[PDB]
Design a protein around this nucleic acid. Structure first.
Ligand SMILES: Nc1ncnc2c1ncn2[C@@H]1O[C@H](COP(=O)(O)OP(=O)(O)OP(=O)(O)O)[C@@H](O)[C@H]1O
Ligand SMILES: [Mg+2]
Ligand SMILES: [Zn+2]
Lengths: 358, 649
DNA sequence: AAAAAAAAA
């Protein structure tokens, strides 16, 4: 069947270390407790985790002979599994709301409360956590000075070009640099899909992560599980959970292209609150996860092992420059005071446009 | 069965006999280890064996490789992998990087004999045999990764599973095909999550190579063959580059032998799995005594005249044209500014004259002697396809740009004949490119700026059959003033009738046609030859065999051979970047002012561009004598050349 | 998407 191999990585100790770091970290008290508290009060909408914090915490705790392994290396070698571990750990230690909440507006929670008041009244289904989650997990790449602080070569970053990325970088966390040319619109995408069951008790749920989805035909309701059908299951748009989806592509800069070559492209997917954070025609450096995508979407029954690849966005620096719409600020106020004190200005401005032409 | 073990141990004995490959493996290991954790280049796990030594050691194994590589190469690479696994010493390895299991695939060099073929010569009886094919790259595909071995994990078991996939084009030996279905369930039903970062992916690219048009049968078109190469060397060379590819030529696919056939007239598919690639270039390196010769010759007072006279010895006259060609092939340095944008760096030459004055021949010589150049004619080209084209890929089904005529000639030189006879519309492409050395394409949803910093040389004949000296220069040339103003130098050539020069050129041309190839009699015509004996090729300073260059004695002044001149220009274009001084500045400004206010008839009007041309020529002449600073003599010679090219002696 | 032939302005 499937032969087995041994790897030096075991996730139990890593999960315990993750919990210890998330509970004990001191940079106000714990930062990671305050942000979770703000999430609980329905104030924050996204979570950012700084790998530099983990690196420095491990480096300073290595002074005592307790730590045995490194976690940022495992993050670099694999990311999505650690995303799942992080969301599980966060949901495990989610704090209590210390503030009032406008509880009537949460239609999803009202619907789930009605479902519970139905099911547990008769003495209930364990809803998956991703349906109940409200936050989003994002990562932040390290900084080169932090790496220079220590002897270890925990570098990452290094904004490779589009063509410099090769096949062995799949699954890691990488940074790319280039110009954005095409940005698509915002379109909602499903995360958890729910079906109404025609008053047959609990409403069956389904979860799909692939880009292709298939619906249900029969349900596990007890009276529907009876020897004759009781109502056809239907998909309910209100109960299901959605997420914003957007895709773009990035072009290599004219500087980095070797002579006699045509610049290449790279697709990129962005989900969550980072949607609409980039515009066509700018120089950026995106950090994210480099993931494969099946070729079966084209459905040609060819390319038995060839597959397409894309990047998943995690953090972006807009870079370039800002016009700012001449927003008023003190510094430019003293600058225009200097200009006023400069006296006649138009001749100087004419002199200052193109000194190259005489 | 045991034949695999016997072959493996025979190859182990062969590797034990020759100690060079072990040294290479140790060097690559220590270099990789040093690159690992010391404050980006990584050497791929590939080694090249010279099968001449293998033939000198064991003829049976050599013949087995050269006849049936399928049953011989895998044991050899297995033995190499085992030797590497025994030699290396890494007591503290990583986790994801230790599972690469790269088989250390090989490369070959040496004499092949009857297996060094051409794309036309490949036939049925050469199948399943290691071969080396020569040709020119015509097109390439995109670099797409493909999967080999996937790693799976289940939370409950804690045991990481792995499944290995192989395709027809992945391995030499045909095995049972495997679909790309991801295993998501264990034998006991445990859920398996695919683990990225531990699986294996390798690059994939397909290229096509065709036989050279020169060595083709009369009245026949060139034919092409396709090459698959992966892992290393995946993005080497480019379209328009002479290559020699060594690999295994094998068939693949059912080819309609199953029920899918619609007619009985079905042929199989043939394809070559490349093992290594080499650049032909009809070599490009320089030795220590080469440097000594270059320096001692550059210390001479008359280097520029010798080099100018060394170009096309069979062309009589046109001395300053040869000098301009020499300055053009190794032109001035490019200047860039954070505020001044871009400054053009090379020089363009245009020639116009009456028929039969040796313009096309000199252009062909420049094409032959240049490091990189592309041949183009005005009538047989279209501007839309001359810069970029949109075509659909057969594999992916998408549409991607194809490089045009001068995009392939980036940082090279483009030679165009019948420039005046080209359609006016296509000229706009030149108007686009020569302006800023950048072509922008925007069509069918593709937006990209392509770099093209090539230099263009053109030759065109005047509107009339023969040049009219008594007429206006503008009305003698069909091209508009806008493009004529860009070209740095305008040269007009006429064959004035003079009995003395007629006699001299007549005896020279008659001397040329009485020539005999060495070692060949005069009674029979020139016959074709085979390739070099080696498929792959490779006391000091006391010989001067091909240094002095005076192969035959006919004049007191010296002459140098072409390959040494190519070596000289290669050295000069890289090792020297000169700077200018105020002494040359004084001469430049003085001669510019004198030329501009002389107020006499001239062939072409001048402007600020001519001074910039003078500066570029001064830089080029500062490069020609291998100096880091510009001397006023360079300014003087540039001024003299310009005055000839604009006034005439 | 790009090359090449034909009738009308
Ligand atoms: N100075 C010369 N020395 C030797 N051969 C010469 C010289 N001038 C002309 N010829 C000869 O003139 C012939 C004409 O060649 P070619 O057509 O290339 O010349 P061209 O001047 O470029 O002509 P065109 O304008 O018709 O293209 C060639 O065979 C060449 O050898
Ligand atoms: Mg000619
Ligand atoms: Zn029902």
């Amino acid at each position: 069947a499937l032969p087995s191999i041994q790897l030096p990585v075991d996730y139990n100790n890593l999960f315990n270390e993750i919990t210890d770091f998330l509970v004990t970290f001191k940079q106000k008290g714990p930062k990671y407790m305050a942000m979770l508290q703000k999430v609980a009060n329905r104030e924050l909408n996204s979570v950012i985790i700084d790998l530099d914090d983990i690196l420095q915490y491990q480096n300073e705790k290595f002074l005592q002979g307790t730590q045995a392994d490194d976690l940022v290396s495992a993050i670099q070698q694999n990311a999505n599994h650690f995303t799942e571990l992080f969301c599980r750990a966060i949901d495990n230690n989610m704090p209590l709301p210390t503030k009032e909440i406008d509880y009537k507006d949460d239609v999803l929670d009202v619907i789930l409360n009605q479902r519970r008041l139905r099911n547990e009244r008769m003495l209930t289904e364990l809803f998956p956590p991703n349906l109940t989650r409200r936050y989003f997990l994002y990562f932040k790449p390290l900084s080169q000075n932090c790496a220079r602080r220590y002897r270890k070569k925990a570098i990452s970053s290094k904004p490779l070009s589009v063509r410099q990325i090769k096949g062995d970088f799949l699954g890691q966390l990488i940074t790319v640099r280039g110009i954005i040319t095409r940005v698509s619109d915002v379109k909602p995408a499903v995360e958890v899909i729910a079906y109404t069951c025609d008053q047959c008790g609990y409403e069956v749920f389904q979860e799909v992560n692939s880009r292709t989805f298939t619906p249900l035909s029969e349900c596990t309701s007890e009276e529907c599980s009876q020897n004759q059908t009781k109502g056809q299951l239907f998909m309910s748009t209100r109960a299901s959970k959605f997420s914003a989806f957007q895709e773009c592509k990035i072009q290599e800069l004219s500087q980095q292209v070797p002579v006699g070559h045509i610049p290449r492209s790279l697709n990129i997917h962005v989900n969550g609150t980072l949607v609409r954070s980039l515009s066509p025609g700018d120089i950026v450096d995106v950090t994210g996860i480099f993931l494969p995508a099946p070729y079966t979407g084209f459905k040609a029954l060819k390319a038995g092992l060839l597959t397409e690849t894309y990047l998943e966005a995690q953090f972006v620096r807009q870079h370039k420059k800002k016009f700012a719409s001449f927003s008023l600020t003190s510094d430019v106020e003293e600058r225009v005071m200097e200009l006023i004190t400069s006296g006649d200005v138009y001749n100087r401005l004419a002199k200052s446009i193109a000194p190259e032409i005489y | 069965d045991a034949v695999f073990g016997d072959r493996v141990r025979r190859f182990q004995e062969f590797l034990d006999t020759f100690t060079s490959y072990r040294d290479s493996v140790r060097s690559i290991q220590v270099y990789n280890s040093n690159n690992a954790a010391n404050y980006l280049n990584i050497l791929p796990h590939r080694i090249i064996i010279s099968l001449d030594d293998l033939r000198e050691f064991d003829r049976s194994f050599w013949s087995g490789i050269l006849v049936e590589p399928a049953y011989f190469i895998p044991p050899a690479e297995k033995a190499l992998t085992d030797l590497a696994d025994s030699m290396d010493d890494v007591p503290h390895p990583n986790a994801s990087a230790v599972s690469s299991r790269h088989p250390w695939k090989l490369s070959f060099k040496g004499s092949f004999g009857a297996h060094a073929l051409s794309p036309r010569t490949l036939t049925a009886q050469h199948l399943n045999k290691l071969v080396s094919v020569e040709g020119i790259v015509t097109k390439t595909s995109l670099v797409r990764p493909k999967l080999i071995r996937s790693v799976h994990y289940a939370a409950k078991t804690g045991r990481f599973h792995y499944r290995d996939y192989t395709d027809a084009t992945t391995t030499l030996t045909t095995r049972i095909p495997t679909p790309a279905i991801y295993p998501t369930e264990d034998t006991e039903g445990n859920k398996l999550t695919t683990e990225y970062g531990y699986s294996t992916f390798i690059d994939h690219q397909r290229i096509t190579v065709q036989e050279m048009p020169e060595m083709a049968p009369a009245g026949q078109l060139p034919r092409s063959i396709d090459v698959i190469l992966d892992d290393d060397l995946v993005d080497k060379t480019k379209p328009g580059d002479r290559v020699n590819v060594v690999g295994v030529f094998k068939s693949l696919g059912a080819g309609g032998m199953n029920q899918s056939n619609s007619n009985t007239l079905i042929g199989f598919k043939t394809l070559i799995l490349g093992n290594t690639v080499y650049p032909l270039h009809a070599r490009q390196m320089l030795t220590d005594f080469d440097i000594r010769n270059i320096n001692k010759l550059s210390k001479k007072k008359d280097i520029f005249d010798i080099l100018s006279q060394s170009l096309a010895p069979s062309i009589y006259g046109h001395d300053h044209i040869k000098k301009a060609i020499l300055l053009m092939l190794m032109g001035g340095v490019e200047k860039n500014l954070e505020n001044g944008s871009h400054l053009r760096g090379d020089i363009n030459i245009l020639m116009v004259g009456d028929p039969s004055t040796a313009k096309s021949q000199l252009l062909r010589f420049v094409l032959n002697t240049a490091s990189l150049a592309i041949a183009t004619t005005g009538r047989g080209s279209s501007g839309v396809g001359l810069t970029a084209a949109v075509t659909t890929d057969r594999e992916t089904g998408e549409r991607r740009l194809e490089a045009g005529a001068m995009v392939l000639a980036d940082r090279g030189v483009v030679c165009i004949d019948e420039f005046d006879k080209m359609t006016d519309v296509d000229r706009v492409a030149i108007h686009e490119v020569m302006e800023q050395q950048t072509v922008t394409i925007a069509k069918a949803g593709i937006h990209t700026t392509l770099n093209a910093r090539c230099s263009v040389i053109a030759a065109a004949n005047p509107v009339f059959g023969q040049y009219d000296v008594n007429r206006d220069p503008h009305q003698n040339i069909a091209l508009p003033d806008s493009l004529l103003s860009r070209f740095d130098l305008l040269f007009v050539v006429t064959d004035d009738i003079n009995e003395i020069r007629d006699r001299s050129i007549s005896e020279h041309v008659l001397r040329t046609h009485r020539y005999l190839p060495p070692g060949y009699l005069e009674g029979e015509p020139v016959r074709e030859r085979l390739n070099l004996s080696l498929a792959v090729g490779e006391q000091a300073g006391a010989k001067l065999a091909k240094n002095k260059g005076n192969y035959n004695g006919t004049e007191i002044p010296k002459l140098v051979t072409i390959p040494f001149l190519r070596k000289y220009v290669q050295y000069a274009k890289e090792r020297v970047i000169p700077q200018l001084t105020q002494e040359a500045i004084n001469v430049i400004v003085k001669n510019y002012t004198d030329l501009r206010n002389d107020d006499n008839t001239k062939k072409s009007p001048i402007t600020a561009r001519t001074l910039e041309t003078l500066i570029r020529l001064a830089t080029a002449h500062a490069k020609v004598r291998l100096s880091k600073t510009v001397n006023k003599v360079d300014a003087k010679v540039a001024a003299n050349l310009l005055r000839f090219a604009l006034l005439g002696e």
